[PDB]
Amino acid sequence: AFNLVGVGPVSQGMGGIGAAFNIGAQGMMLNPATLTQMQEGMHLGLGMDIITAELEVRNNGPYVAPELSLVWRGERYALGVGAFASDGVGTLENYSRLIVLRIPFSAAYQVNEKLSVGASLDAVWTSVNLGLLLDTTQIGTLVGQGQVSGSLMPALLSVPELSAGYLSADNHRASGGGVDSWGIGGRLGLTYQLTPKTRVGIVYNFKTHVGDLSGNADLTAVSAVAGNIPLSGELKLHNFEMPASLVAGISHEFSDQFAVAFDYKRVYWSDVMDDIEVNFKQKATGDTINLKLPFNYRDTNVYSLGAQYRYGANWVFRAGVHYAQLANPPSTPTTSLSGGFSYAFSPEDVVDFSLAYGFKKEVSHSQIVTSISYTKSFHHHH
């Protein structure tokens, strides 16, 4: 949903690991089986991700993604709920901002001293702001390929000197602009302590069925002669299905003071079919314009490697490497380096902090994700 630099400052500080490593309450969103690693009691977590991006040769500004968690740990069970947000933008510009708020309902169980199982069911709210410029040639290539339809086509081609159509659907540029939808996702994982120092973990993340995103949009016809004629109406996006993913990984704790974790993850873009329809209906007339953009993606592999050193009773230090690349059934991979630390102000109060620098690819893409969280733990153990 994000970009697996991980979930929370402990995972992100270690390059994205978490299939077998106790990343805290964020395990709800990675491998919920790891929640059995948390101490008994009640855990409240507050944090956010602060993403600033830069692109050499679309807002760079600080994106803020908050995370809330409540986890109960007693005996063999863990129960959790939270709210995990992601924010970011892709690319009269062509752009898409995607907001995903995932609200897990999570549980985990120690089957025995070696085997832990866990699952989450997400309620998922997806929101997209977008702008899409289509010139006269592109409309043509797409009208002859049977990809544009709707009674708005002939009236638009008859705009004098028509140069481009602009689909705008943005909360920030017009009130109620954008589209949104509630949906459902989830994950099912386990951990296995096969060796006293080596734990292995596996989690399958389900395909998120987001369902039809609806809302408001403007379609502006651009003409040097006739001005920019905006038409207002309803917009519907059709077939989204965030892809399933499989994460397998291992944690090795040479001592309580020093651990290393490594994870491998396959994201299954190829099994998301592509019927991605875009329909706009003009609110005065009921005249519509229909549009397909079936864009296929290939599977992605991600490798995550990090380490953690407990220094004294209050300080923990982390570092990690992250490598994402298209999959085996020619592309530049994305690499990221990370570091982080934790401070415990008390047995009940811990601050975690994370910094990750990523790079992709004539295009250069630089991205810094700052991650900070606070956990307040009230213990119980009877």
Instruction: Give one DSSP letter per residue of 137-204, joined into a string.
Output: HHHHHHHHTT-EESTHHHHHHTSTTEEEEEEEE-TTTSTTBEEEEEEEEEEEEEEEEEETTEEEEEEE
- Experimental determination approach used: X-ray
Q: Give the separation between CA 44 and CA 42, rounded to whole angstroms.
A: 7
Whose CA is closest to 356, among 77, 100, 53, 37?
53
Q: Give the separation between CA 10 and CA 49, rounded to whole angstroms.
A: 12
Q: For the chain, what's the residue count?
A: 382
CATH number at residue 189: 2.40.160.60
Handedness of CA 145, 150, 156, 157 (dihedral sign): positive
In-domain check, residue 372 = yes
DSSP letter string, 302-313: EEEEEEEEEETT
Q: Give the separation between CA 108 and CA 43, rounded to whole angstroms.
A: 15
3-state secondary structure of 238: coil
Whose CA is closest to 99, among 112, 109, 110, 86?
86
Neighbours of 378 (CB within 10 A): 9
What CA dihedral angle connects 33, 303, 242 and 358, to 10 degrees? 120
Residue type, 309: Y
Q: Give the separation between CA 276 and CA 269, rounded to whole angstroms.
A: 14
Name the helix (H) or strand (E) containing 134: strand 115-135
Q: Contact 314/346 with Cβ under 8 angstroms?
A: no
CB-side neighbour CA atoms (13 Å) of 67: 25
Residue type, 56: E
Neighbours of 359 (CB within 10 A): 14
Name the phi and psi angles at 301, rounded to 5. -105, 140
Q: Contact 358/367 with Cβ under 8 angstroms?
A: yes
Q: Contact 263/251 with Cβ under 8 angstroms?
A: no
Handedness of CA 8, 13, 19, 22 (dihedral sign): negative
Name the helix (H) or strand (E) containing 276: none
Whose CA is closest to 333, among 360, 294, 309, 311?
360
Q: Contact 44/69 with Cβ under 8 angstroms?
A: yes
Q: Give the separation between CA 128 and CA 125, rounded to whole angstroms.
A: 10
CA 41 from centre of chain:
29
In-domain check, residue 370 = yes
3-state secondary structure of 228: coil
Q: Contact 271/245 with Cβ under 8 angstroms?
A: no
Residue type, 336: S
Neighbours of 96 (CB within 10 A): 15
Q: Give the separation between CA 382 and CA 364, rounded to whole angstroms.
A: 55
3-state secondary structure of 127: strand
Q: Per the structure block, which two tokens stand in for 197?
A: 């120092």
Give me the residues paired with residue 19 across strands: none
Whole-angstrom CA distances from 325 to 87, 145, 266, 268, 350 are 22, 32, 10, 13, 34
Q: Which residues of 186-201 are buried (b: 16+ CB within 10 A; e: fewer)?
A: bbbbbbbbeeeeebbb
Q: Per the structure block, which two tokens stand in for 139?
A: 């409309």
In-domain check, residue 3 = no
Query: How many structural domains is the chain composed of?
Result: 1
Residue type, 287: D
Which domain range does residue 345 map to?
9-379
Q: 315-326 and 300-311: which strand pairing? A: antiparallel
DSSP letter string, 9-72: HHHHHTTT--SSS--GGGGGGS-GGGGGGSPSEEEEEEEEEEEEEEEE----S-EEEEEEEEEE
In-domain check, residue 190 = yes
In-domain check, residue 2 = no
Give me the residues paired with residue 124 across strands: 102, 183
Q: Which residues of 153-176 are buried (b: 16+ CB within 10 A; e: fewer)?
A: beebeebeebebbbbbbbbeeeee
3-state secondary structure of 271: helix
Name the helix (H) or strand (E) containing 325: strand 315-326
